[PDB]
Write a protein that binds this ligand. Structure first.
Ligand SMILES: *C1=CC(=O)O[C@@H](/C=C/C(=C\[C@H](C)C/C=C/C(C)=C/[C@@H](C)C(=O)[C@@H](C)[C@H](O)[C@@H](C)C/C(C)=C/C(=O)O)CC)[C@H]1C
Ligand SMILES: Nc1nc2c(ncn2[C@@H]2O[C@H](COP(=O)(O)OP(=O)(O)NP(=O)(O)O)[C@@H](O)[C@H]2O)c(=O)[nH]1
Ligand SMILES: [Cl-]
Ligand SMILES: [Cl-]
Ligand SMILES: [Cl-]
Ligand SMILES: [Cl-]
Ligand SMILES: [Cl-]
Ligand SMILES: [Mg+2]
Lengths: 1014, 121, 202
């Protein structure tokens, strides 16, 4: 029934249309769904615009008329110049007429705002096409019409707001450079009369919908109008006094005044400075008298959330911060302006107490701006001393939990380990720390006094709470580095002594977890102190080891992180033999490592081993270092040795417990290799050959399992476990090679057995059993020693290129990890070992080119970016070869493939993320012909004998674009290509010409002269 | 849940098998509780999603049910439920429930089977 | 007590996945582009009673846009979505907002930066400031990990009901009832279909 409106061979039943629209907007379920699909089909019918007038005339459903206007909007924006002139005139006439008709009827004007707004925007679309060249009197008649009716005047303000938006705010992406300039210039040329109307309305009224609309338009104009309109009229006085007093104009006025605070204005003009001071002075006076005094509890007000109070307080913060960041100096020298400067900042202090993370970030950005300035500018900090002192309190009391603090209070009042990282407070903590560090430097006595007395009120119990000890401890930790070592020494001693006091008196697992977390945070934040106090450091570390046996998993995990955090900075003190110690502490740690790490989870044990590696690499005497490495790896090496025995006796390792043990042995090696890098080699050497044998054994188990159980085998715990062994082996080798300093050993000892062990296994497994980690390992191999292993690189390509390409060339989604690593590998080979591609058979080289272009077409950034880089690097590789047969053949076979494929992704609206690199590639390609760097004809008798590659390139491109974009005129295409080829040495200009083309292809009748823009 | 004793609680992820598509679909992550009604002595599974607290499982631990392993996991159980009312009207599902560790999975099964014996009385 | 919520933002930002998560609990890995709009009722239980959102999940792909701004008519609230791993999606936020507020002049709006679970974040936390001058609420979210997933709806609920202390509460749980050849076959298929994301913590 509803489908009838889709039949254009019959008259449009408007009543049926209104039913379909009503069913869509007000209905539900299947009926709503069907109506939606019908409406979209109706809307998309390219003749549907012809029904628009009938709908507007006869419909009684405002949504029907909205939809009619959407249909016209699409026609206007995309096909306007395809219309006969009569249809353009007609459409303009009934759009204009409908607007007049709706403004003149009070009830309609009051109750149909959405439809009138939509009509206004639609009119603005017509203006974009027609004005002023074919509508020169639009503005003068708009201005004239304004005086005849309050409704029309108000609506004219809406129209002008939308026009300003479309021309100045949203034109960049939607118009050619030339058209945008045209329209901006046109609006500039008539703005004097527009402003006259605006100012008059603002003068002759106080607080009404017309005033609001006018002010809404003013906000937009302020983005671009010359400052004289603002400063050489009385408008600042009206904005900052009159319009601040009535609440229905206050919001928009405040936004206008924020934008005024950003206007471009002379810096050497004393009178203008006075005006800038005066409007701020006025605005602050109005706030204090009409809204709330400086003493008001804005935290409370915001939390109550009455009316528009939250929006207002947000907007006030934005106004104060914006104005003061630019202009506070105007208020700093003159004694009569001091109270204003300080009152403004006191409002900001009060705003900074609001509970609203995002608002807090806005105010914190301002505080950063202030304190950073006060840190450097002579004679300023004293002005703000009281403000800064209040700020210290606000920051210390609102410190967010650092990433390191792993305990949190759950809904039942229990202190537990966090479920997940609080990822969205990372930046917030850094911003808080930054400001507090500055504040500490500005007055270290005040900061210390605040912290030391707050801490005293925790101990005596007067202000004791988890929140308060936490925020305080976090703040104390966060200011590390701000004091001189000497000052810090006394501060830290006092703090620790008091935290230890709190530890003795507050008992129970929850309390103890809180206090432990806070002490760990503080001690980890003061390595400089730890370095100077060995006894203390030693005792802290032993306590961390005790926590490694905590049943409290949060405290346990934090002990491990704190251990490595401290070791990263204090390692040297673990490696030397300290006074009054019998051994270096690393020896003590290693000797007792089994006990210390017994209750830890595997990954925590690995972190512990990694930390020991950091310490061992401090030992630069090779003999002693290698002995330490050997001692550290004792337990995993002994486990390893006995597994290598059992395994080599018989492949049946079919034990899940054994697979876990092996995995953990390798993970431990990875962990130590990560911190020791090049120093790890002797340990790698101990396990290397047996490890690669194990890789083979495990590979056979995986293949066998897949054969016996099917692909589903790869999902099983057993097989996932076996692959973990393979992946971790690959990771270990990758990790070592990425950090190796002796590349000769890598090549002569590591590479051949590696390739022999991994390549054929990758190639000869079914797709689902192939580990992407193989590709990742090979990338590092090629990156580090590729220049030394030309035949090895060829071997790598032969084994993974074609089989991996076949996995990833059927869609953009399957095998996502393989996809990403595949193009990273190709990238580094093309960079470092281009000769490997030169050796490919022609058929394989074609696949390489295909693979590159396929990468272009991804929306996935990891792939797309590498694809475009490979293409560019490849072109350079070829160019570098000079006039030789391979280069000549490459251009003959692939130059136009690369040009057309790059054009395709540039122009399809589905690869906008790659624009810059696409343009770069296109420019390179064109510049090759422009610079006569291609030594052979790119054509085959197809074109006359002497024809330059320049002439042929234009012809090819014109033909390509003509067929691909048949709605463009020949001159559009010709002018575009002329501009583009001329600009192939100027990337920014070349890119602008591309952007202009992308605009023109979306519409009909684009002006070819646009490509002359300069 | 005032009239109910908490016999067992464990953090879990619950799936339902969509048979049309041949895939498992998450139904919720949160606390899975075994609840014994103090008036009737019947034991049910009640599970709620974190944060929204919406019910994603609500059914009797029927004696007829049998926990089966999933091919991909050593820390999950699958079972047919004939009457779950998490969504409203009683409805049949094939559920899978996964835990943070094998230990937790094995504890669930033990508790699950104890609750079945309680429901038998 | 029901409110029309329009959800807008670039294609592939996770609008539909976000809604589905809320609807059924599931996480849809596949990207099937929304065609025009999909309307779903979505209810939350609060300490002020139930609140019903009629979620108009709109198409972000231009070629599938359908009625475009026609969807926004009479919306009472909104979510603008972008993807923190795709900078272009943030750059397009002002365009979505523009089109939205032209139709919906005074509604509460949440801006959401989705996909924070992904390691390689491209839209830096520090860069996200568009919401400030526009009075939008902002949250980092992940439909995949559920990070902050309830936040947009809680905030909107508070604004719409007008109670800043509104909280989600637990539904009272009705006692469940005491209730074959195909069952065997159905269970077999279930057992032998691997569970997804076996490397996750749960
Ligand atoms: C409460 C219960 C619990 O079980 O653990 C507690 C956690 C404690 C932690 C670290 C503490 C700070 C380690 C203690 C070190 C200590 C007492 C070292 C002494 C050898 C020492 O140097 C003493 C005498 C002086 O006074 C110290 C405290 C200050 C200094 C160095 C003065 C100076 O050099 O002049 C967890 C990491 C808690 C949760
Ligand atoms: N990693 C990750 N992926 C996500 C997240 N949310 C959605 N996705 C993925 O991103 C893709 C796009 O999701 P979808 O919900 O279809 O996006 P959309 O905004 O509705 N697209 P459209 O506007 O075209 O209808 C899907 O593959 C989905 O699995 C997230 O939080 N994290
Ligand atoms: Cl309407
Ligand atoms: Cl002037
Ligand atoms: Cl050191
Ligand atoms: Cl022409
Ligand atoms: Cl848009
Ligand atoms: Mg969608």
């Amino acid at each position: 029934a509803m489908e009838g409106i889709l039949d254009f061979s019959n008259d449009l039943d408007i009543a049926l249309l209104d039913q379909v629209v009503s069913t869509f907007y007000q209905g539900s379920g299947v009926q709503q769904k069907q109506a939606q699909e019908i409406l979209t089909k109706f809307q998309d019918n390219p003749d549907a615009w012809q029904k628009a007038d009938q709908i507007l005339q006869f419909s009684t459903n405002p949504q029907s008329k909205f939809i009619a206007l959407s249909i016209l909007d699409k026609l206007i924006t995309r096909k306007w110049k395809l219309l006969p002139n009569d249809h353009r005139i007609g459409i303009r006439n009934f759009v204009v007429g409908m607007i007049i008709s709706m403004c003149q009827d009070d009830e309609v004007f009051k109750t149909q705002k959405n439809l009138i707004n939509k009509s206004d925007l639609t009119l603005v679309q017509i203006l974009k096409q027609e004005w002023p060249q074919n509508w020169p009197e639009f503005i003068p008649e708009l201005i004239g019409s304004s005086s005849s009716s309050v409704n029309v005047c108000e609506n004219n303000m809406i129209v002008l707001k939308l026009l300003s938006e479309e021309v100045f705010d949203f034109s960049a992406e939607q118009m050619t450079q030339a058209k945008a300039l045209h329209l901006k210039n046109s609006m500039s040329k008539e703005f004097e009369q527009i402003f006259k109307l605006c100012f008059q309305v603002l003068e002759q009224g106080s607080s009404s919908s017309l005033i609001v609309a006018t002010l809404e338009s003013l906000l937009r104009y302020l983005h671009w109008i010359p400052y004289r309109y603002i400063y050489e009229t009385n408008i600042l006085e009206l904005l900052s006094t009159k319009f601040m007093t009535s609440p229905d104009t206050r919001a928009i006025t405040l936004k206008c005044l924020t934008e005024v605070s950003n206007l471009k204005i002379p810096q050497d003009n004393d009178l203008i400075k006075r005006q800038t001071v005066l409007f701020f002075q006025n605005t602050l006076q109005q706030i204090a008298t009409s809204v709330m005094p400086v003493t008001a509890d804005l935290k409370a007000t915001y939390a109550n959330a009455n009316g528009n109070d939250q929006s207002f307080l947000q907007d006030l913060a934005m106004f104060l911060t914006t104005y003061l960041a630019r202009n506070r100096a105007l208020l700093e020298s003159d004694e009569s302006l001091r109270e204003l400067l300080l009152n403004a900042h006191q409002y900001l202090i009060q705003l900074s107490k609001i509970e609203e993370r995002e608002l807090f970030k806005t105010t914190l950005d301002y505080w950063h701006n202030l304190v950073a300035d006060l840190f450097y500018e002579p004679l300023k900090k004293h002005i703000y001393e009281e403000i800064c002192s209040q700020l210290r309190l606000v920051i210390i009391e609102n410190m967010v939990r650092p990433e390191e603090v792993l305990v949190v209070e759950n809904d039942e009042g229990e202190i537990v380990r966090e479920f997940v990282k609080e990822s969205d407070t990372i930046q917030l903590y850094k911003s808080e720390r930054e400001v507090l560090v500055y504040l500490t430097h500005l007055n270290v006595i005040d900061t210390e006094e605040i912290m030391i007395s707050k801490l005293a009120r925790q101990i005596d119990g007067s202000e004791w709470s988890w929140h308060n000890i936490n925020t305080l401890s976090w703040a104390i930790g966060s200011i590390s580095g701000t004091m001189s070592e000497d000052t810090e020494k006394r501060f830290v001693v006092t703090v620790i002594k008091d935290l230890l006091d709190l530890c003795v008196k507050k008992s129970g697992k929850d309390n103890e977890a809180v206090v432990a977390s806070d002490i760990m945070y503080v001690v980890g934040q003061y390595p400089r102190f730890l370095k100077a106090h060995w006894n203390f450091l030693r005792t802290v570390i032993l306590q961390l080891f005790e926590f490694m046996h905590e049943t409290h998993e949060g405290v346990q995990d934090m002990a491990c992180d704190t251990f490595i955090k401290i070791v990263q900075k204090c390692k040297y003190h673990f490696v030397i033999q300290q006074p009054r110690e019998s051994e270096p502490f690393i020896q003590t740690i290693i000797r007792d490592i089994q006990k210390t790490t017994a209750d830890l989870q595997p990954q925590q044990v690995h972190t512990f081993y990694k930390a020991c590696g950091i310490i061992i690499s401090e030992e630069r005497s090779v003999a002693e270092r290698n002995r330490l490495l050997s001692d550290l790896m004792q337990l995993p090496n002994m486990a390893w040795d006995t597994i290598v025995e059992q395994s080599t006796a018989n492949p049946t390792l079919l034990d899940s417990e054994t697979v876990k043990i092996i995995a953990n042995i390798i993970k431990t090696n990875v962990a130590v290799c990560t911190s020791m890098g090049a120093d790890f080699y002797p340990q790698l050497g101990h396990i290397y050959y047996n490890m690669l044998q194990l890789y083979r054994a495990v590979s056979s188990m995986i293949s066998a399992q897949v054969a016996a159980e099917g692909l589903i085998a790869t999902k099983t715990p057993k097989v996932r476990g076996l692959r973990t062994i393979k992946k971790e082996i690959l990771k270990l080798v990758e990790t070592y090679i990425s950090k190796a300093r002796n590349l000769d050993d890598v090549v002569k000892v590591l590479v051949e057995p590696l390739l022999n062990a991994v390549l054929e296994d990758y190639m000869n497994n079914v797709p689902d059993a192939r580990d992407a980690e193989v590709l990742n390992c090979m990338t590092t191999v090629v990156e580090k020693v590729g220049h030394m292993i030309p035949q090895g690189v060829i071997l790598i390509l032969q084994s993974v290129f074609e089989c991996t390409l076949d996995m990833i060339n059927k869609d953009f989604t399957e095998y996502p990890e393989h996809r990403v690593e595949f193009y990273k590998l190709l990238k580094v080979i093309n960079e470092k070992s281009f000769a490997a591609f030169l050796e490919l058979p022609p058929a394989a080289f074609k696949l390489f080119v295909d693979a590159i272009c396929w990468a272009f077409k991804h929306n996935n950034r990891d792939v797309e970016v590498n694809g475009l880089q490979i293409a560019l690097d490849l072109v350079k590789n070829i160019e570098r070869m000079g006039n030789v047969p391979f280069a000549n053949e490459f251009h003959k076979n692939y130059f136009f493939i690369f040009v057309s494929e790059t054009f395709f992704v540039l122009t399809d609206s589905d690869h906008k993320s790659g624009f810059s690199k696409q343009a770069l590639l296109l420019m390179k390609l064109i510049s090759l012909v422009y610079d006569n760097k291609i030594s052979v004809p790119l054509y085959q008798a197809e074109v006359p004998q002497g024809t330059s590659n320049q002439v042929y390139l234009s012809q090819y491109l014109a033909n390509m674009l003509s067929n691909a974009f048949p709605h463009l005129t020949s001159e559009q295409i010709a002018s575009f290509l002329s501009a583009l080829t001329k600009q192939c040495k100027d990337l920014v200009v070349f890119k602008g010409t591309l952007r202009d083309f992308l605009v023109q292809i979306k519409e009909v009748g684009g002006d070819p002269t646009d490509y002359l823009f300069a | 849940e005032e009239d109910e004793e908490v016999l067992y609680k464990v953090r879990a992820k619950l799936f339902r098998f969509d048979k049309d598509a041949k895939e498992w679909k998450e139904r919720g992550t949160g606390d899975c509780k075994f609840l014994k009604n103090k008036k009737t002595n019947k034991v049910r599974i009640l599970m709620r999603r974190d944060k929204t607290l919406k019910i994603c499982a609500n059914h009797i631990i029927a004696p007829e049910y049998t926990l089966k392993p999933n091919v991909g996991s050593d820390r999950s159980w699958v079972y047919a439920c004939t009457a779950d009312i998490a969504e409203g009207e009683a409805e049949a599902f094939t559920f899978a429930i996964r835990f943070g560790s094998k230990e937790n999975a094995d504890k669930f099964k033990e508790e699950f089977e104890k609750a079945q014996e309680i429901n038998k009385k | 007590v029901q409110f029309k919520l329009v959800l807008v933002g670039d294609g592939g930002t996770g609008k539909t996945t976000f809604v589905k998560r809320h609807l059924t609990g599931e996480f849809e890995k596949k990207y099937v582009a929304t065609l025009g709009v999909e309307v779903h009722p979505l209810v939350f239980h609060t300490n002020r009673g139930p609140i019903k959102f009629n979620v108009w999940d709109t198409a972000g792909q231009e070629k599938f846009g359908g009625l475009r701004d026609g969807y926004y008519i009479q919306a009472q609230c909104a979510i603008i979505m972008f993807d923190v791993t795709s900078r272009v999606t943030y750059k397009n936020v002002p365009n979505w907002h523009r089109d939205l507020v032209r139709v919906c002049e005074n509604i509460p709006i949440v801006l959401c930066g989705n996909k924070v679970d992904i390691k390689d974040r491209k839209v830096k936390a520090k860069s996200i400031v568009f919401h400030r001058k526009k009075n939008l609420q902002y949250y980092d979210i992940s439909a995949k990990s559920n990070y902050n997933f309830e936040k947009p709806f809680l905030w909107l609920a508070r604004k719409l009901i007008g109670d800043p202390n509104l909280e989600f509460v637990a539904m009272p749980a009705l006692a469940p009832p005491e209730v074959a050849a195909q069952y065997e076959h159905d269970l077999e298929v279930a057992q032998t279909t691997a569970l997804p994301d076996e490397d996750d913590d749960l």
